[model samples]
Target: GAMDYTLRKIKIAAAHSLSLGLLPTIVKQMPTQFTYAVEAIDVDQAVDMLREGQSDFIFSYHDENLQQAPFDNIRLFESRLFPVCANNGRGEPRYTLEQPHFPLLNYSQNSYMGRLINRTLTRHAELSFSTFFVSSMSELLKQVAMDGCGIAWLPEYAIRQEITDGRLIVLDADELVIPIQAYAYRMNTRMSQVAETFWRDLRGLQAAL
Candidate 1:
């Protein structure tokens, strides 16, 4: 089968690697003539870039406002959020709301998970404490449980390596785990053949991965 049209090139923006892990394998098998320009940005900025029409599609955790925006989309995968602290932190992996003092280190309040973690602590745990926000996930985790700052909520994949090394510990692995959905979304405007073909090929890549 032949593609409906030929595309010169396509530009894609994502929070993480679009072709580094699983996507490249699928794209290599496709019978298409196209080039891709993949750019990585902060998750929050990626969403902003998509809304401003600076990029064709976005790959990151789902945002509620995507539907509210002038775009149609579909989720590609799902992952759970977890909190990690330094193994040297006082007490066990999980902390109770009653801890005389709770110092929390996390991503900026502007981040989706950062805000959610703050709200959850206030509403569900009925506790209040000092919170420190940092720009990067690695810094946040390193400062908190490692450097003895506080606790932080981070994605599982981001901290998998640290956990294996016994540098960071998971707090309340069973109770605090929150599942989230990741997605790939396209705007309503017409897309290039390369973009269209990439979308179709991405599914095959995902399946094999």
Candidate 2:
């Protein structure tokens, strides 16, 4: 019975943003005997699927609402959202924080990142800017920023390679940096054996890393 759960299929609901990079690493660590499937969707939709019992686990960003619920979680990683842009030839962002009417590349208004940025920035200042919102994923917003479309607050993990490659530069707005947390989580009750074992496997991977 020890290895019986490995034969059971598990469904994972992953956030679209994380699906591009982080999800692959998690899958690579899984045992070959493990049967699994994944759906890459918006964070809110993923969580909804979990709540509806359609998925065994969610791999996504930290959500304030989930914290108040009875869920089991493994802390995946800590990250930060950086206000970033492509540099002008003069070595400064084409858009500056002080500039009014700057075009802002932003996440969908309801996503965790969107809410966090809105709450944090509203607390920091009275804003005056136009926004171009991307509803699909943060990567699209990051690409828009890279193309000099506008300034954006993007997670560190998503922008690391862009920064290193000189495709993107973090702007100098210390107040705009938002702390980001991600996790693999499921409801504490009615958890399947496959889910429990996968959670433990992830924790073990974290320890090894």
Candidate 3:
């Protein structure tokens, strides 16, 4: 006889977008009898959790975009990174200081995206800029970019609407791109039936992209 599935609660770890974009839709599709635990840590953290058995399922950006993966992996989605700025208050670009040398409000080096950004920036040695690590998303966009405090290296998805309305400006610089992708995974082939059902649904979503 099949074991009872409804008695188990599943655990999930995911990055920023999946929780905001996909999880809502998946919630409606999840079985009514199923219970779950979810935490939106960085993709690397999610992978660590999955490997450590803290989470049964994880959605992350290419498993730190380095090293070998310990779980079953699938490509979820991709995005491009760009150099961006906005009007301070008057009429001057933030990335240009006294003599066109400006500050770089960079992403942290803790997460994979942060590491990717550093690698990209370091590759371009001709660029003259100082680093000011930005802490939060809103602070980078609203305070840092809006005030023209410094150059923000962020993904296009974050400032799409602001670009349309002319609030944020993608500066003219050599095209630098960090191709970010999410991979949803599990520990191995042995997952609870409830976890398996949700994992299947998430995998099904890749077909749409």
**Most TM-score-accurate candidate:** 2
lDDT of 3 at 2: 23
The CA lDDT at 88 in model 3 is: 56
- In candidate 3, which residue pairs clash? none
Residue lDDT tens for model 1, 82-152: 76776644444554434555777765566565666667676655555666546544344554556656677
lDDT of each: 0.61, 0.75, 0.63
Each prediction's TM-score against the native? 0.71, 0.85, 0.76
Q: Work out candidate 3's RMSD over C-alphas.
A: 4.7
Q: For model 1, what is the error of residue 168's alpha carbon versus the real structure, in angstroms, after optimal superposition?
A: 1.7
- For model 3, how does the per-residue alpha-carbon lDDT over 39-112 read when each residue is reduced to its tens digit? 76765576557656577777666653323545677776777776777865554454552334567777555666
Q: Which ten residues in a row have the lowest lDDT in candidate 2?
A: 1-10
Name the candidate, 1 or 3, with the larger lDDT value.
Answer: 3
TM match of model 2 to true structure: 0.85
Q: Is candidate 1 or candidate 2 better by lDDT?
A: 2
lDDT tens digits, residue span 11-124, model 2: 777877676767667668767556777777776775567677677878888876566567777788888889888878666676777668678887777677788877876886
Q: Model 1, which residues run further than 4 Å from truth?
A: 1-9, 15-48, 51-53, 89-98, 136-147, 207-209
Q: lDDT: which candidate is best?
A: 2
Order of candidate numbers by lDDT, starting with the best: 2, 3, 1
